[PDB]
């Protein structure tokens, strides 16, 4: 069940999944609808689901990782798609080999240096590229 803010924006949560506390490498995953494109893992908040809880669930489902949830980075709107996304830092401590989206849709994942992540996100996901602005 998709949820919405009072203005009709879709409620979403996302994590910047870092390899370490240095935050130099981030995990991106393949788009479901276009598998040669990279996205930040994230998705819809469920009814009455806390954003931090939604972000951890979405990263487990889409990216097959777990770890230590850090700070909220910010709340980012995509006016074109009508999304409002809570974006958190996660430090990855567990990498699972056969996760929900790997089994269900063959979703891929890959470590990117921050500057390379921003580069591959820019064309199709410029708001996701802005998650890294800091
Ligand atoms: O395929 P696109 O370009 O139409 O974008 C897709 C995007 O696909 P992607 O970023 O993968 O290309 C999905 O993400 P996902 O299918 O990879 O999960 C994303 O859904 P979401 O991430 O908000 O939703 P869920 O992860 O499932 O909760 C939205 O899909 P949905 O609304 O069918 O759940 C988005 O569509 P809009 O909300 O209309 O922008
Ligand atoms: Cl790192
Ligand atoms: Mg989802
Ligand atoms: Mg999603
Ligand atoms: Mg999802």
UniProtKB/Swiss-Prot annotation:
Enzyme class: hydrolase
Residues engaged in binding Mg(2+) 1: 42, 62
Biological processes annotated in GO: adenosine 5'-(hexahydrogen pentaphosphate) catabolic process; cell-cell signaling; diadenosine hexaphosphate catabolic process; diadenosine pentaphosphate catabolic process; diadenosine polyphosphate catabolic process; diphosphoinositol polyphosphate catabolic process; diphosphoinositol polyphosphate metabolic process; RNA decapping
Annotated compartments: Cytoplasm; Nucleus
Cofactor(s) needed by this chain: Mg(2+); Mn(2+); Zn(2+)
Keywords: Acetylation, Cytoplasm, Hydrolase, Magnesium, Manganese, Metal-binding, Nucleus, Zinc
This enzyme's EC code(s): 3.6.1.52, 3.6.1.61, 3.6.1.10, 3.6.1.62
Description of pH dependence: Optimum pH is 7.0-7.5 for PP-InsP5 hydrolysis. Displays strong endopolyphosphatase activity at pH 6.8 and 7.4.
Catalytic activity field: diphospho-myo-inositol polyphosphate + H2O = myo-inositol polyphosphate + phosphate; 5-diphospho-1D-myo-inositol 1,2,3,4,6-pentakisphosphate + H2O = 1D-myo-inositol hexakisphosphate + phosphate + H(+); 3,5-bis(diphospho)-1D-myo-inositol 1,2,4,6-tetrakisphosphate + H2O = 3-diphospho-1D-myo-inositol 1,2,4,5,6-pentakisphosphate + phosphate + 2 H(+); [phosphate](n+1) + n H2O = (n+1) phosphate + n H(+)
Disulfide bond listed as a keyword: no
Binding site for substrate: 2, 10-12, 31-33, 81-83, 107, 125
Domain Nudix hydrolase: 9-134
Subunit organization: Monomer.
Name of the protein: Diphosphoinositol polyphosphate phosphohydrolase 1
Organism expressing this protein natively: Homo sapiens
């Amino acid at each position: 069940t998709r949820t919405y803010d009072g203005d009709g924006y879709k409620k979403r949560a996302a994590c910047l999944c870092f390899r370490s506390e240095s935050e130099e490498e981030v995990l991106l995953v393949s788009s479901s609808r276009h598998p040669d494109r990279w996205i930040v893992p994230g998705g819809g908040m469920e009814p009455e689901e806390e954003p931090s809880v939604a972000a951890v669930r979405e990263v487990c489902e889409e990216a097959g990782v777990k770890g230590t949830l850090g700070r909220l980075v910010g709340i980012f709107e995509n006016q074109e798609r009508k999304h409002r996304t809570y974006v958190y830092v996660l430090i990855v401590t567990e990498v699972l080999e056969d996760w929900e989206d790997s089994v269900n849709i063959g979703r891929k994942r890959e470590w990117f240096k921050i500057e390379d992540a921003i580069k591959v996100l820019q064309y199709h996901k410029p708001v996701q590229a802005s998650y890294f602005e800091t």
